[PDB]
A and B are shown apart, each in its own frame.
Chain A
Amino acid sequence: PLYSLRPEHARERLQDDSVETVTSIEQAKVEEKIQEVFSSYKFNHLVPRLVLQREKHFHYLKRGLRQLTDAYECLDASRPWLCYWILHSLELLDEPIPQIVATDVCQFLELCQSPDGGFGGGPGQYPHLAPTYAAVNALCIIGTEEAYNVINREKLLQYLYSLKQPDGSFLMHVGGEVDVRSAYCAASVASLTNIITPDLFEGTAEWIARCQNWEGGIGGVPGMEAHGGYTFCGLAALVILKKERSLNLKSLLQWVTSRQMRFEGGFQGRCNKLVDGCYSFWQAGLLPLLHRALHAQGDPALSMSHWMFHQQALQEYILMCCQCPAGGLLDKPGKSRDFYHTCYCLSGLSIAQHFGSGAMLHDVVMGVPENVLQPTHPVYNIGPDKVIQATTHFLQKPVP
């Protein structure tokens, strides 16, 4: 019954027009490998078994939360990301985190925090907004009085304020540049910690809104090509600020939906590019957001059981083509595993298997019923419970 294994699915293969270019050549090679992957069952005379290697993944994750090989030196300035990706993956798999590791993670994020606010990529590194978002996310996942407490709110707002630009944008860090990605980071920490003052995000929705181009998606900066990672950041940030309507939602829905690979089943980050497991979150994650936005406009034609993407086809991509047998997920077959791709492939899969839009709930889970993951919040990419818990907690505190 697998949608990607149906013989008809072959008619959904790169329809090159007998004119080759780097783009079609490349696309046809991924298409050929993915095909080998789908045909592996028939060629070997077995009935497909879509099973998510929980145990394997948990191994990788449990371990990495503690020690990494020198192969992660290129992430020496991204330690807090290491935490989020891993803690998030874990919560996604339902694996609990023992209070001592929680306290440990808690204490390291501490060493990562600047006395002037925000978090650095490592102990003693300067504060940047990405590690700031990752660290705050990481803490809200633990969600213990201890975690919450690490975050120094009066300085977090001081720091955010020193990044804010007049045009509505935000610096990724003192002396650095702006991009939609930073607006989201700041909206996110500012939201979860109840630090949003009345002028903090003034001009931000308008600035994010001008990064939407002719494609319908959002560029990293005004004038840039439509990009999934940025699009997610733009729409997400706008949902926090409650200004989604600032965008051309109609052209954005058309653009996301068109980023699904009719063959591979997963999502590319840019039109005319290649599939990539992580875009399972970045792009498919835009569907529940668009949904929430259109719903708030009393849109009556919305579905009440499914996202506006082939949940099935995407789940088959993650399950069949994105798991490394040693544990951990990946971009695509032939690529090495990494915690980033573990985090987002999982994040995406959870999104693809869970629908909810009020009281209307509806799962759809390919392969073995154990493949169900814990739901993920589409704005923050942390567990819905983790969001409610954190905001209730922080709301009980006065905005600096």
Chain B
Amino acid sequence: FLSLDSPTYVLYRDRAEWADIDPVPQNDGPSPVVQIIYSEKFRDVYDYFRAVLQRDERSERAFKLTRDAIELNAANYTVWHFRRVLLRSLQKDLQEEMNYIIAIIEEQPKNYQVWHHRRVLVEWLKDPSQELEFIADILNQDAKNYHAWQHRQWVIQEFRLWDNELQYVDQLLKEDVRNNSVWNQRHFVISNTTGYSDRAVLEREVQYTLEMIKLVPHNESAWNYLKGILQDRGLSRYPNLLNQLLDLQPSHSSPYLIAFLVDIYEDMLENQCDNKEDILNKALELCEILAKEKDTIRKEYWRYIGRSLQSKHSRE
């Protein structure tokens, strides 16, 4: 086969195996809008794809053409559809097709069609043996590629491949404690394996998280994580978490510690705590410290917080 990028690649209208079929021009209307001035190459491939699509030609040449129409526009879902019908009725080998999709993902990891197709392949073949490691290759180039993580969440749930992901997460979390996609991955694994209700997994988790904060005080990912696994059961359910954060403040702190403090306070007053007035005032002062200085981009947020905090707890 000729690569769409070979030095010797030839237009389709100049091929022998294609001399019998007339290309089919695009019908944009008597006089169009948002009309694209396709290149000769582009127009060539899609003019001939229109032809095989129109005649529903489940031919081998057709299948080969789809490939060229995919490189030209890997987002053309119509072509991806046709390719799949061609792949099935031609009894085309799916491991070769995996080799194909492996290559084009590597080539454009940010395209959606490219990832769905891989999913279709893995389901068809009922085999996820090479998934986790391929995905780990993509994540090696873009540790945050949404589709890659999507794909690895799918693989792991669908074929029960939970056993090694926390190791994986720890691998990556080590490379960049800031990769929010990896924190999310952490939550995912734990949630679907041991869950956060296990006193021992919680303690560990928070502990680990406090350790991460201590080393990277301004990394918002660890803070959201620590707030995420405890705000559900009620921040106030954990009474010495406040004293501890106050002890980290000295030489660490920032707008993340202070907001968390006001977050602990909201739930405290929300749960008939004691010293309600001192805590309320304590929280409103931070609300302004945040609005007026530490985190003014969010001034409006914090103004609202301190406002509703009052409406909710004023002595009245």
Question: A interface vs B, CB < 8 Å?
Answer: 12, 15-17, 19, 21-24, 64-70, 72-79, 82-83, 86, 101, 104-105, 107-108, 111, 120-126, 128, 173, 175-177, 213-216, 219-221, 223-227, 251, 253-254, 257-258, 260-262, 265, 270-273, 299-303, 306-310, 313
Contacts and interface: CB of A to CB of B under 8 A. Distances in A.
A300 B311 contact: yes
B175 to A, nearest CB: 7
29 contacts: A15-B218, A23-B176, A65-B34, A68-B37, A70-B36, A70-B37, A73-B42, A76-B36, A77-B76, A82-B34, A123-B26, A124-B78, A125-B78, A126-B78, A213-B187, A213-B228, A214-B224, A219-B184, A220-B150, A225-B181, A226-B184, A227-B146, A254-B301, A257-B298, A257-B301, A260-B297, A270-B180, A299-B308, A300-B311
Given A17-B219, A22-B175, A271-B224, 8 more contacts: A17-B216, A67-B37, A108-B28, A108-B33, A124-B26, A215-B228, A258-B220, A310-B298
B37 A69 contact: yes
Contacts of B254: 15
Given A107-B29, A273-B180, A214 B77 contact: no
Given A215-B224, A257-B298, A68 B35 contact: yes
Interface string B229-241: 1011000000000
A348 B34 CA distance: 24
Given A104-B31, A124-B50, A224 B179 contact: no
B97 to A, nearest CB: 16
Interface of B: 26-39, 42, 46, 50, 53-54, 72-73, 75-78, 81, 84, 116, 119, 143-144, 146, 149-150, 153, 157, 175-181, 184, 187-188, 215-221, 224-225, 228-229, 231-232, 254-255, 295-301, 303-304, 307-308, 310-311
A104 B219 CA distance: 52
Given A23-B179, A272-B180, A302-B304, A66 B35 contact: yes
Nearest to A64: B34
Contacts of A105: 33
A121 B77 contact: yes
Given A86-B34, A175-B81, A271-B220, A310 B300 contact: yes
Contacts of A121: 76-78
Contacts of A313: 297
Interface centre among B36, B146, B179, B304 (most CB of A within 10 A): B36
Nearest to B24: A124
Contacts of B177: 19, 21
Contact of A17 (B28, B32, B76, B215): B215
B38 A76 contact: yes
A224 B77 contact: no
B10 to A, nearest CB: 19
A227 B39 CA distance: 36
B73 A271 contact: no
A83 B53 contact: no
Contacts of B77: 77, 121, 125-126, 128, 173, 176
Contacts of A76: 36, 38, 42, 46, 73, 76
B268 to A, nearest CB: 15
Nearest to A128: B77
Nearest to A226: B184
A224 B184 contact: yes
A352 B116 CA distance: 36
Nearest to B266: A250
Contacts of A214: 184, 187, 224-225, 228-229, 232
Nearest 6 pairs of A and B residues by beta carbon: A214-B228, A23-B178, A301-B308, A301-B307, A225-B184, A82-B34
